[PDB]
């Protein structure tokens, strides 16, 4: 939902590691150039 959206904030957004845009937190990936977040996956923790 990058068009109007109350739910999520621009604060939380992320900037493409290759377009250095501002996407949502939602979906985790450039709706421009088409670019994942490079930290998205949950690794092993403890
Ligand atoms: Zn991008």
Same mark, same amino acid.
């Given at each position: 939902?990058? +068009? +109007? /959206? ?5 604060? /939380?957004? $992320? ?16 709706? %421009?150039? $088409?670019?994942? %977040?490079?930290?998205?996956?949950? +690794? /092993?923790?403890?």
């Amino acid at each position: 939902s990058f +068009e +109007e /959206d109350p739910e999520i904030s621009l604060a /939380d957004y $992320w900037k493409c590691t290759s377009c250095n845009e501002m996407n949502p937190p939602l979906p985790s990936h450039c709706n %421009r150039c $088409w670019a994942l %977040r490079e930290n998205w996956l949950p +690794e /092993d923790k403890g």
